[model samples]
Target: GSSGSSGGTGGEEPQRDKRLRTTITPEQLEILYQKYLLDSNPTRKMLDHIAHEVGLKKRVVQVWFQNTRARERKSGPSSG
Candidate 1:
């Protein structure tokens, strides 16, 4: 008896899209907003608490806060 062949068997394989990439959906954005932007505005402890509730790392929550603050500063109204 001989071993099985390893070459293609003439069947068409499913093509993958190389351009496909992961993105955050709106629902995730909402959760992130609620976790970081709701009343009291979230201290480090609160951020860590929210991260634990949502099963994310504390560092990730910290970075989200940092980025959100940066964006707000960039887009917020400034006094002359």
Candidate 2:
């Protein structure tokens, strides 16, 4: 005999933030910095390639390059 019973069950759910802040590890930084030395502004394709090596999003690598250049220029050359 099958008895009809109404029952409700709760499912666990998890949420994430929209803007994810990526922390750069030392290993990744070494690679990025070395590349920056050769080419401060790398091509988009280069960024994508390096992104793979660093295991980070291309956008994140792009931002890192951007920040590095900005900082460089801030203290880059002194006009004598």
Candidate 3:
């Protein structure tokens, strides 16, 4: 979440909170990425599958996919 703070100079400083680090490891990320790629696109069911296997909640898996897609959209080839 973004936080707004008042500065001494009467300016508002909008600071973005540092994202909480996930307990999911790099190996888990790789596995999730592989699964997502294999599916052509991520579905909530796919995420649930990974979450069930990894012992994480469905919401955590959803967030992981969200972040992963955001990164891909930023760095991967653009779609028309």
Candidate 4:
């Protein structure tokens, strides 16, 4: 059967966006902030181990720390 015969997007997977925007809830950010205070550096394995407890995507947690690290260099002790 021709997959594109209908008005569907054709059984093919969706395209990836140029960039994905992640939104963190204030409550979620609070938990992450507290962790950051203890250890500014958290590896992917570390994040995945506890991502659910903090309520966030594993990458989001990683990126959150990444942003804060960058902020430390750019704004001198600030969360980005």
Candidate 5:
């Protein structure tokens, strides 16, 4: 049976953050670029590790690396 909520304050906000537009901070970018410089082809474990170290979602880190690599391909002639 469903219980009744007399006060109606039970409509609490969710704990997890919702996906939306966001800006990567300077510190996070610094770490991200460093990881990319080290190895763009990171394993799943590496992605999780970087996510934890940089305080950002692994998904974001993954997408950023993918996009950056694509951009490099478009530009042609990597500095490396």
Candidate 6:
């Protein structure tokens, strides 16, 4: 289970408390990119598969695909 953060935010701080970001490893990104090239819209089963193999939460895997899709769409690179 995931642990909760303690309450601690007083004045005179260096920086604000930002959301914790996930850092995908080279292997993880390789797997994810291959799948993305195959199909941007991956099924639930595939999401679970990637999550399990990549050692990442299902939510993270799904979000990665979602963000990748959005980025590719926004860029509009010429793809055959």
Count clashing pairs, candidate 4: 0
> Which lDDT tens digits does candidate 1 get at residues 18-53?
332244445455777875666335788887666555
Q: TM-score of every model?
A: 0.51, 0.63, 0.51, 0.60, 0.63, 0.61
Give the winner by lDDT: 2
lDDT of each: 0.63, 0.79, 0.68, 0.73, 0.78, 0.78
Lowest-lDDT window of 10 residues in candidate 5?
14-23
lDDT of 5: 0.78
lDDT of 5 by residue, 1-80 (tens): 67765564557664344432356777789999999989888888998788767778778887889888888768668566
* Candidate number that wins on TM-score, 3 or 6: 6
lDDT of 5 at 8: 44
Pick the winner on TM-score between candidates 1 and 2.
Answer: 2
Higher-lDDT candidate of 1 and 5: 5
* Candidate 4: Cα lDDT at 56: 75
> Please, what are the lDDT tens digits per residue for candidate 4 over residues 3-76?
55546565876544423337777777788888888878877777775556775777888887888888776855
**Which portions of model 1 miss their true places by more than 4 Å?**
1-28, 39-41, 76-80
Pick by TM-score: 3 or 5, better one: 5
Model 4 misplaced stretches (Cα beyond 4 Å): 1-21, 75-80
Per-residue lDDT of candidate 3, residues 1-80 (tens digit): 89888656666775334343357666666766677787546677777777767655568778877876778878668669
2 against 5, candidate with superior lDDT: 2
Candidate 5 matches the true fold with a TM-score of: 0.63
Worst 10 residues of 4 by lDDT: 13-22
Pairs with backbone N, CA or C atoms under 3 Å apart (clashes), candidate 5? none
